[PDB]
Structures are given as C-alpha cells and as structure tokens.
Amino acid sequence: SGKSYPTVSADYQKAVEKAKKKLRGFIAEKRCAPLMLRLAAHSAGTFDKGTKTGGPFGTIKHPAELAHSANNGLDIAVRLLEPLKAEFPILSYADFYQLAGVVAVEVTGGPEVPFHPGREDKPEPPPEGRLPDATKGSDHLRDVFGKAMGLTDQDIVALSGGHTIGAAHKERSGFEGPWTSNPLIFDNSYFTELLSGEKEGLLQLPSDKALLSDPVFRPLVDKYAADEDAFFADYAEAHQKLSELGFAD
Ligand code: HEM
Numbered sequence: 001s002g003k004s005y006p007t008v009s010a011d012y013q014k015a016v017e018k019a020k021k022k023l024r025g026f027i028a029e030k031r032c033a034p035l036m037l038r039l040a041a042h043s044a045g046t047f048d049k050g051t052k053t054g055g056p057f058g059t060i061k062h063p064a065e066l067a068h069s070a071n072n073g074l075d076i077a078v079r080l081l082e083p084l085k086a087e088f089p090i091l092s093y094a095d096f097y098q099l100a101g102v103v104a105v106e107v108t109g110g111p112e113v114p115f116h117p118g119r120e121d122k123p124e125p126p127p128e129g130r131l132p133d134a135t136k137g138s139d140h141l142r143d144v145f146g147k148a149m150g151l152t153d154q155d156i157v158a159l160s161g162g163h164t165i166g167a168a169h170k171e172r173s174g175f176e177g178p179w180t181s182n183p184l185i186f187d188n189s190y191f192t193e194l195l196s197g198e199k200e201g202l203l204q205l206p207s208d209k210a211l212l213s214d215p216v217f218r219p220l221v222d223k224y225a226a227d228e229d230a231f232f233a234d235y236a237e238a239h240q241k242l243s244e245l246g247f248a249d
C-alpha cells in the first residue's frame, strides 16, 4: 500500500526474470538462503522514515557498512553474489540483493513474496546503529521496526519468523546454532519451538523471547504456530514491505 512503482525498460525486466532463475539455482546449490535473507534484511532494515535515509539502496556492499558490528559475516554474502551480479550489469545492486532475499524465501519452500524492480543504488551508507539488538526486548523492537522503519506489530512478529531458516554463529553475533530442527526449510517451526520452550540444540535470542510476553506479539505467535498458512500470508506481506522501505514512496 502507498506505493507507486517506477517504470523500468523491457531489458531491465528481462534481466530481473533471468536473474531470479539464476539466483534460485545458485542459492540452492550453495545452501546460503539464510545468509542471503539476513543480507536483504540488514540492507533494508536501516531505513528511517523520519529522515528518509537508509533502506535497501545497495549501500550494504560498501566496506564501511559491512564493517558495522551487526553486519559481521555479511561480507561473505556480498562476495558470494558478486560473480552472479556481474552477469546482470543492468540491474542495480539494490534490486539484486532484494531479489536474492525473495529467492532465499522461495527456494527454502516459503511464500512467493512479490517483487518490483527500480531501486536506485545510493552513494552513502546510513550511520551505524539502526539494526535491531538481539539482547533487547519489545520496546526496542517497536523503536526499530515501528518508529524507524514504519512497520506494524504484525510485521514484527511475522518477520521474526525469518529465523525459521538459518543459524547464529559465535564468530559473527556471538550467539550460536539454529532456531529450528530444519534450518533450510521455511515453515512455522520458529513459532512452534518458541512456544514449546528451550529445547537443547536450538537457539532463542532475548529478542525472540520478547515476543512471548508482549500482549500484542503473543497472540500473533500463537496464531502462526497454529496456522502456517496465516504465517505465510503475513510473512509475504511483511517481507514485501521491508524490501520496499523508502522505495516507490
Ligand atoms: C526482530 C529483530 C531481529 C534480531 C534481533 C535479529 C538478530 C539476528 C542475529 C543475532 C542473528 C545471528 C547472526 C549470526 O551470528 O550469524 C540473525 C540471523 C538471521 N536473521 Fe535475524 N534478527 C532480526 C530480524 C530478522 C529479520 C526481519 C529477518 C528476515 C526476515 C531475519 C533473518 C535472519 C536469518 C535468515 C538469519 C540466519 C543467518 C544465517 O544462517 O547465516 N532476522 N538474526
């Protein structure tokens, strides 16, 4: 909602379609879907609505932004994508990274998130410190996703479900291990695990646990644990919004 997507040329559209295919094959083969989803989220998640700065505009590949502590390990993601990006010189990096995030969800069996091209690469990275802190709680989540990004409480819970794929690494954030028993499968297991308690071998961040005790977040966790279809619908909506922050309005 509220979006007016720009016109891109037929050749640009052709390149998007071909890049989508190539990204599917590459991401599946390399087993890097979760890392690519993290990359897309960290690129988009710097948007501040009050200043209209940051967001998914290709700045994450700048050495200055990759050096942000919250971005530890994302240099791997950028390097992995560089050879493929080079096959699509017409595409913006911004579009390519957001397309990679959409593909990461699709190949792991998640919903089909709508994608619209036309993000323009911006010259200057946003200041460090906008991304969410895993050690903080609900107030902080609302500060970051709500007050800065302009997303809803529903979006916060659905997007937290991105942790259904992948793992933390002690050398990156310091946290360690997968949230789920099937970390390459995009399903509602993140929420099922969050409800069932601390199972040995599985990770819960303080920011994940914050969802269980918040009056608004908890009913959403309950809904998504009970209804994977409802999770997929809300997730697709939220991911689209995240990927389009500051873009096309
Ligand atoms: C809600 C606030 C969030 C917090 C506090 C948070 C924090 C973290 C942390 C600490 C890690 C581990 C990084 C590492 O050590 O390798 C991580 C990984 C990850 N995050 Fe988030 N995140 C949040 C939101 C999101 C969102 C919105 C998405 C996308 C929808 C997402 C997708 C992922 C994925 C897929 C991984 C796994 C990366 C891998 O396997 O290499 N996260 N997150």
Ligand code: NA
Pocket (backbone or CB within 6 Å): 164, 165, 180, 181, 182, 183, 184, 185, 186, 187, 189, 190
């Ligand atoms: Na999973």
